[PDB]
Amino acid sequence: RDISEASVFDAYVLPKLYVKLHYCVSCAIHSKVVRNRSREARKDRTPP
Amino acid sequence: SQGQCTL
Amino acid sequence: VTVKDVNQQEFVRALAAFLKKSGKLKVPEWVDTVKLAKHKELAPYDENWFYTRAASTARHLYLRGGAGVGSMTKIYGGRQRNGVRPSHFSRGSKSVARRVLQALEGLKMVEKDQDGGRKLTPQGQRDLDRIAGQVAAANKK
Amino acid sequence: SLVIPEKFQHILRVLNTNIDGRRKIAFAITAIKGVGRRYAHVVLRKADIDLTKRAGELTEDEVERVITIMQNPRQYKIPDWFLNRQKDVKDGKYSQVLANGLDNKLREDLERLKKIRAHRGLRHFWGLRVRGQHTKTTGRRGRT
Amino acid sequence: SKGPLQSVQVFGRKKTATAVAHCKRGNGLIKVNGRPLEMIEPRTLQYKLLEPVLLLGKERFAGVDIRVRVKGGGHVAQIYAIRQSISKALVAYYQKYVDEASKKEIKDILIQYDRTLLVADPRRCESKKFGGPGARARYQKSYR
RNA sequence: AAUUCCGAUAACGAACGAGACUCUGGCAUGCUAACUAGUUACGCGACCCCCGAGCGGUCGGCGUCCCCCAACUUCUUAGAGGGACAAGUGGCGUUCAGCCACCCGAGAUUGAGCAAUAACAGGUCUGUGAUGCCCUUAGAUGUCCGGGGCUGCACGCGCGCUACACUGACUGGCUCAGCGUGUGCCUACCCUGCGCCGGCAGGCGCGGGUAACCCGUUGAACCCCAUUCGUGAUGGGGAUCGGGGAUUGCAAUUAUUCCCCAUGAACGAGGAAUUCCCAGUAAGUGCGGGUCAUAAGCUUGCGUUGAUUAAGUCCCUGCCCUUUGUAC
């Protein structure tokens, strides 16, 4: 909103930043992503 | 991030 | 009218003025060189403190009878500040108002009770009621 | 309550020390080391001088009588227990010491305590406690 | 007319402030220990004391009389104990001896103004619990 | 708040712990009956206005246990019972558990004791004539006496008190308190009232209480009112020191403490950085009991004054549960 107020454009500009992300497993945990799962937990998939 | 206000 | 339907502050001031006008209350030798209370840091600010306190004392004796030295000292206690140490409570003094109750005895307004203490005489009660009526009349007009 | 009273002095230089005239008579004479607040009240009562007026409005005759009361208060049959020093060790006379007199007497007592080599005198010379203080946390300001 | 023993006595409490009202038919005198209602020590809170007088009809408090005696409480507590005493003394008298239609309207007016005129507040002093100077508080502690 | 409860469900019956139970305050114009308490009146007296006035107004001044010279418990408390259980209306909710608004209601979350197995190399041998082992034992580390320090002092650390002011402080007056201890086997030592003397702590004579009976209607403190000081480290803040006296015991100097006159330094709200607190709460402010020959700046409680902040989360620091790598 602070940028939008100063924006000249008639609400036609919405730039998006898309960046590929790659973490190995030693620091995947530190990032907090991939928290450890339960014994039946492992057999899962995407999450929601 | 303390639930002060009430995205 | 009784003494209840008049202002307490103005009634005390009027009685103190009446005692000053009469000039018959007994005055001790130590007039303006002693403290009224133990807790105080200074001598009484204004003169006639003997008359003003005698005026208030006669009023307290009117409300409650059979009051002696121990009863009076509880009443007039004062907030004793001891500087660095936490402050405590100090009872009223003893000897000075013993001259007051001897002064009232000299003026024939207190009488020794059957078991102890001093009780209001008809002369004292009559005087307190008429000055109360004068106070009420002055307040109205 | 006069607008501009005559013979008004902003300060007074009696007893070699200035007294703040803009304050009241009962509270400006207190700069003397022998005259405090309560003592100032009782002497004014003895001198029957009104307390409303300040130190700068009192006449010369009133000031002189106040000074005389200061110097010899026991003459006016004031209570003995009210005196500064009572029952002096060196003399049997009862009197009050004022300003440099109080300092002179105190130094005479202090040098006397040093000569006798008593416990109070030794710690006074050492600059320490006397009245049962706890120097574990007492004396943390005036001593390095 | 001259109906004897037409008196009702009510009580109110505000933190152990026991105020008793002895209400009967009379000229309209309200006294506390024989001391007038207006001539009370808290003159600042005198308006609060006279609130039932200003809210209900002065004719009603002239037909009846109230006597208040207090043994316990404080200063604000005692004023409210007396204030609630005369309010429910008038309510009790208006319940027992006069038309109940007016009893409903005065009760409705009292509730509309402030419910505390009739209810005794349940909240009392809460016992202190060890570990801190107040009942809920804790004595400040540090790890080192 | 809660594996409490509800539901899909290989769990059903249960049990431990929350819960539940027990302690104190919240109430009927309910009961029982309380002179060791009050209320209303009764026959008085003291008075106030006033004609002799008025069913006038106050008395914690008299008595209604040798009495007919009256009863009752609303207020003072001590026995028993319901009332508050999300019960009733509305909304949210898998229409279930549960959550919120609302009316009648003394109160719509009133505070506390006990509090599952077990882990602490948690602390106490200085709590017992509970104790293992070692240790000085007649120049004892015992018992007996006396004195000294346990407080010392350059410096840092915890909880705390006093204030840095004008909503203030000083002087004078006025109006309210409850829990609660109060004369002891060995143990002398209790609470105090009344009256007098003394400027004050204090002293002297006369009594009550082994206790709802006396202190004590516990006339406590800011608080309510009137005067003074008026932005000046200014009567306030009062640390340290001198002198005088009583207090307690044998004894107070290395001052138990207290009373009067005194010197009268910092203290313009304090950087980091943390703690406690959500309703009678915090906080102010006192006052009891524990301590004691005398005692509190400690501690537990009882009060009077007594508000806003929030009904939220795990952002910082930590616990619980599961999924759970793991030679632990």
Q: For the residues of A30-43, what is the DSSP string, one character each?
A: HHT-SPPPPTTGGG
Chain mean position to CA E28: 18
The Cβ of residue C104 has, within 10 Å, a number of other Cβ atoms equal to 23
C-beta separation of C61 from C69 below 8 A: no
Task: Name the residue closest to F254, CA to C1'.
Answer: D132
C-beta separation of E58 from E91 below 8 A: no
C-beta separation of E30 from E86 below 8 A: yes
CA angle E76, E82, E84 (to 5 degrees): 100
What are the structure tokens assigned to E76, written together?
A: 């604000």
Beta strand pairing call for D19-20 and E64-70: unpaired
* Residue E67 φ then ψ, to 5°: -125, 130
Touching chains, E (3+ CB pairs < 8 A): C
CA nearest neighbour of C6 among C138, C126, C134, C132: C132
What are the structure tokens assigned to D3, written together?
A: 């607008």
d(CA E83, CA E114): 12
The H-assigned helical ranges of A1-48 are 2-6, 28-31
d(CA C6, CA C70): 28
Examine chains C and D and say if they touch (3+ CB pairs below 8 A). yes
Beta strand pairing call for C88-90 and C110-112: unpaired
Residue E61: burial class (beta carbons within 10 Å; 0-12, 13-18, 19+): buried
Q: Which of C30, C31, C33 to mutate: most D Cβ within 10 Å?
A: C33
- Give Cα separations from D141 to A8, C56, D121, D135 (angstroms): 66, 49, 22, 11
E1 in contact with C, Cβ within 8 Å = no
Q: Which residue is listed with tokens 């505000």?
A: E14
Residue C62: partners with Cβ closer than 8 Å, 6 or more residues away: C3, C120, C124, C125, C128
| Coil, helix or strand at residue E70 | strand
Residue C141: burial class (beta carbons within 10 Å; 0-12, 13-18, 19+): exposed
Residue D25: burial class (beta carbons within 10 Å; 0-12, 13-18, 19+): buried
C-beta separation of C78 from C37 below 8 A: yes
DSSP string, chain C: --STTS-HHHHHHHHHHHHHHH--S---S--SSS-S-SS-SS--SSS-HHHHHHHHHHHHHHHS-SB-HHHHHHHT-EEE--TTSPPEEEPPPSHHHHHHHHHHHHTT-EEE-SSSSEEE-HHHHHHHHHHHHHHHHHHH-
Between CA A40 and C1' F13 the distance (Å) reads: 30
With b for 16 or more beta-carbon neighbours within 10 A and e for fewer, the A10-46 pattern comes to eeeeeeeeeeeeeeeeeeeeeeeeeeeeeeeeeeeee
Q: Which residue is listed with tokens 């804790």?
A: E138
What are the structure tokens assigned to C65, written together?
A: 């009878």
| Strand-pair partners of E8 | E23
C-beta separation of D9 from D28 below 8 A: no
Which residues in chain E touch residue C6, judged by CB atoms under 8 angstroms apart? 39
| Coil, helix or strand at residue D54 | strand
- Give Cα separations from E16 to C139, E12, E27, E82 (angstroms): 36, 9, 31, 12
Residue C22: partners with Cβ closer than 8 Å, 6 or more residues away: none
C-beta separation of D23 from D55 below 8 A: yes
d(CA D56, CA D29): 11
What are the structure tokens assigned to E20, written together?
A: 């008793």
Residue E132: partners with Cβ closer than 8 Å, 6 or more residues away: E138, E139
The count of domains in chain E is: 1
The span from the first CA to the last CA of chain B, in angstroms, equals 12
Between CA B4 and C1' F115 the distance (Å) reads: 37
Strand F: which bases are under 7 Å from protein Cβ?
Answer: 24-27, 29, 39-41, 46-49, 55-61, 74-76, 104, 106-107, 110-112, 151-163, 170-178, 192-202, 215-227, 229-230, 234-245, 253-266, 274-283, 285-287, 296-306, 312-315, 322-325
For chain C, breaks with the C atom over 2.5 A from the next N come after none
Q: Which domain does E134 fall in, by range?
A: 1-144
d(CA E77, CA E102): 29
Residues 82-121 of C with CB under 7 A from strand F: 82-89, 91, 93-96, 98, 101-102, 112, 116-118, 120
Chain mean position to CA C89: 20
Between CA D93 and C1' F206 the distance (Å) reads: 42
d(CA C108, CA C22): 14
Between CA E25 and C1' F52 the distance (Å) reads: 27
What are the structure tokens assigned to D58, written together?
A: 């009192």
Contact E35 C7 (CB under 8 A): no
d(CA D85, CA D102): 9
Q: What is the resolution of this structure in A?
A: 2.5
The span from the first CA to the last CA of chain C, in angstroms, equals 16
C-beta separation of E6 from E13 below 8 A: no
C-beta separation of D98 from D33 below 8 A: yes
SS3 content of chain B, % helix, strand, coil (to 5): 0, 0, 100
CA angle D38, D44, D45 (to 5 degrees): 90
| Coil, helix or strand at residue E6 | coil
d(CA C36, CA C49): 8
- Number of helices (H), then strands (E), belonging to chain B: the values are 0, 0
Which residues in chain E touch residue C5, judged by CB atoms under 8 angstroms apart? 35-36, 39
Q: How many CA atoms lie within 13 A of D13 on its CB side?
A: 1
CA nearest neighbour of C27 among C103, C95, C94, C92: C103
Beta strand pairing call for E19-25 and D11-12: unpaired
